[PDB]
Symmetry: C3
Subunit: 382 residues, 3 copies
């Protein structure tokens, strides 16, 4: 939730999430779900979004209904912010543990500093069980195993209640006497010195000394109880390993790209050159989490969110085997209610009417090439 309201061109021109898998659709409490996939950083990064020099891989959900057990970018655990390069592709994996029952829309997201949220496709996952069964065991380097759900709760309650009680006692010591009107009149009359006695001064001295001594003793006792402590671990982790992918033996030029403004579709003229890899055929156009597929060339079998999957939303004028070398100019039409449901038609309000997306080409043997396209998008009103 939160993507439909984001500018259409910003969603089109930031990060592209390609083949994704979810290990389970329905999980029990304390069971783990794995979300893997690839994300590509668009070369034409918008200028109002800072470059992903400081980026964090996040899980979009209405709260800690899951707990993120681990997250890996390129096989490396990433508990901190990371640095990503423009134009590179990265594998990502996220292992989550179920905490609260219910149906949850879970998304993979990249939070970018100086940019904001970049939400990926969301999937509905059902958690069955009771929240009381959730456990979060962690073993420390000191040899102690604790449960993070209730660890250190009683100590915090005790100390906060103790200090609150001390403050309440300090206020109530003075609250046993007339408070506001008689004291104000006495101060106005010049009898302020009569409002504080020697016993009050001794009580204040005792309160101050007891507070300081208790703080010192509590710090000493806490140090004795936990002689081994480390500061909070923070920093930006550089040197993320990107994917070394086969360059596309397929070249695609966008002649024109238009959308009818009333409109639930997008149309584009494309010149495609096959540089080998056998006769190929376009099977899918990915724009903003929406996948328009050509049923005759490719069929999704990964449980891609159906609200974002158009099984026959790709209409190519001529989708015949493009013999290696053939340069065919084709008119592709990406049509689906998701265009209007995911407010991609709101590119009419955007201060930049340019789109970007991914095209997937398959040969007879099923090998897939990914081609990256970007162009300006012209609205049609006649």
């Amino acid at each position: 939730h939160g993507e439909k309201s984001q500018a259409a061109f910003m969603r089109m021109r930031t990060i592209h999430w390609y083949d994704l898998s979810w290990s389970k659709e329905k999980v029990k409490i304390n069971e783990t779900v794995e979300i893997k996939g690839k994300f590509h950083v668009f070369e034409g990064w918008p200028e109002t979004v800072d470059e992903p020099d400081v980026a964090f891989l996040n899980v979009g959900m209405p709260g800690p209904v899951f707990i993120r057990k681990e997250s890996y970018i390129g096989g490396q655990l990433v508990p901190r912010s990371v640095r990503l390069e423009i134009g590179k592709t990265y594998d990502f994996r996220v292992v989550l543990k179920a905490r609260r029952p219910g149906d949850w829309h879970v998304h993979t997201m990249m939070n970018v500093q100086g940019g904001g949220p970049i939400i990926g496709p969301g999937k509905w996952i059902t958690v069955e069980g009771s929240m009381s069964e959730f456990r979060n065991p962690v073993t420390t380097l000191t040899g102690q195993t604790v449960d993070l759900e209730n660890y250190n709760e009683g100590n915090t309650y005790f100390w906060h209640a103790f200090w609150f009680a001390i403050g309440v006692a300090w206020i109530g010591y003075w609250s046993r006497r007339p408070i506001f009107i008689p004291r104000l009149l006495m101060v106005d009359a010049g009898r302020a010195d009569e409002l504080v006695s020697a016993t009050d001064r001794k009580v204040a001295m005792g309160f101050l000394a007891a507070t300081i001594l208790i703080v010192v003793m509590a710090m000493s006792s806490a140090n004795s109880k936990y002689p081994i402590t480390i500061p909070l671990q923070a920093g930006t982790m550089r040197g993320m390993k990107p994917l070394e992918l086969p360059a596309p033996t397929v070249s695609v030029k966008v002649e024109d790209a238009t959308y009818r403004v009333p409109g639930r579709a997008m149309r584009m003229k494309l010149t495609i050159t096959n540089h080998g890899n056998s006769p190929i055929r376009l099977g899918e156009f990915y724009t903003a989490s929406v996948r328009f597929l050509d049923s005759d060339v490719y069929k999704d079998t990964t449980g891609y969110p159906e609200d974002l999957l158009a099984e026959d939303g790709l209409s190519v004028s001529d989708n015949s085997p493009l013999a290696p070398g053939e340069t065919r100019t084709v008119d592709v039409t990406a049509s689906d209610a998701a265009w209007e449901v995911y407010r991609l038609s709101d590119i009419i309000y955007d201060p930049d009417s340019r789109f970007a997306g991914l095209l997937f080409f398959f040969d007879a043997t099923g090998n897939r090439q990914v081609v990256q396209i970007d162009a300006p998008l012209i609205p049609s009103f006649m």
Copy 2:
């Protein structure tokens, strides 16, 4: 105009504009002139100029004597700011349309954010005709063809005059009575409440209600008249395609570079190694829009501004065919009044006495290699 006053080293060390062409020297009104060429970004970019992450290709002229019909960087239209990389070469093309008659010095420039203006060579172009004949037709996506010279002029005049008249009427309603002295005396005397009557309150209420209602009705009518509107299109366009140029089979090392301070020339010792490409010969040294040529090796036939063209300003101790492999140390002398006219001799006031420029080598067949040189420049006073 405006380059002679810019620091000599800043002009030497930012952008180099090489082979340029102008389609016409004399044009009529509404006729188009094309300026094409190449620009190279110097690797040793000055630190006080921000990197050209946000750069705009501009035309330097005393105003809209021309209108910039289009501009292309690497074959791509660039109506917005673009991103350029240090050390890369780009083709540029600019098509301008003549608007005002007269002789105009036209320059191609790169405005760089956090840096300032980078002016290129200027050429004198004559426009013959009358300004009243200039037309700027534009066809909108709604099917309307308009002339940008006078489009929406009457509407703006009408609305501004209407609101100015309303304000004048509001002031003049109160201006029919004594204004300053009697009213001031009455306010001082305590008779302020007598200065505003019930009729005045009713007039003020009517003015407020009429203003609000007129604004609302005008907005509704404007929306009805123009139901299709888009916001201003802005942004920085990345992914500019640079030139893939042959690396210079010629290696040049600058041993020493000196200039006499009184002085109208510059001298340099150079070690040149030919790595193939047949016997070569130096034909031209480009510094800051100034081209020093060796008449025996090369002759300009592009109409390069004569104030910046020194046909025999390159004197090479030995400019004989440098057999592939020969490593000759030569003393080159670049001499021309342009050195003093374009204030390149003002490098003596610069906080950085280092120069950069381009050397052009030609073989027997006429093939040209471009070598890029940079060195510190030492003034000579004895």
Copy 3:
């Protein structure tokens, strides 16, 4: 001095200084000492240190006990700040001239803007002689040879004394009369106009006119005496040539890296793959200026500061010739008091417990390969 107090991980993860040489250990006054070596910029640059876009090569010493005659980065003199790229290796050379007698700990350092100091290994150098024998001759472009120790000293003294005397005379002219109490009483009584006479006004006018005229005449005389002047030369020098080094035919993966917190050592599990270059053997681990060596494989003969040299501080479970192709998992133990002396054990207070260093592999013929390792460092308390 000043490195032991710097965070251990910051010292481990910034710049690595490898093979270094000092021309002399004991020098006389006016004699020169050359310090050469290589420095590598770590790929995982810490986020709190700005990238070395503006870096200066500096000499760490308690003052001008030496004078830095020259400094070269990649064979190019670097009197100004320079730009360095992450992940590149550079040669550096520094020629210093002895000025003051005594024993001096001299370090090579890289000052990085927005980062702070990066100190390298320090060496003790003895200077014998008298400071009065030190000379700093410099020949100017005007044909004058001067000594920078005493040049322009007398002129500065004369002008400062002259202006101080003028100010003292101005104060003392008024100081001959009663100063504070009688004048205050007269001003309070309304007799302020009697405290300044016409002669005082004439004296003030003469002082003002003389000051302005003297300033103008002094400027004119200084211009006449030195008709050739240049501004201060400043700027950041880009285009530093890095080393083109053989990629390591040796691959090393860090399985685990741990240190006992009481502790004077560090332990690591490593998987090493030989990709040719004959049977190899680990001979040295460099962490933070500390070099742990395996005496049986390699011996230092460069006079590396002994406080930072552990001749037998590298213990490899199996350090037998790793036949090209062999993938052996070995347990290496780097032990030395320098770990505690140079406060590398203070990584326990660091907000980032990750280390980086260099491994040196030698074959039978003595050829050396450098492998770069980085991992998180886990403290052991049991």
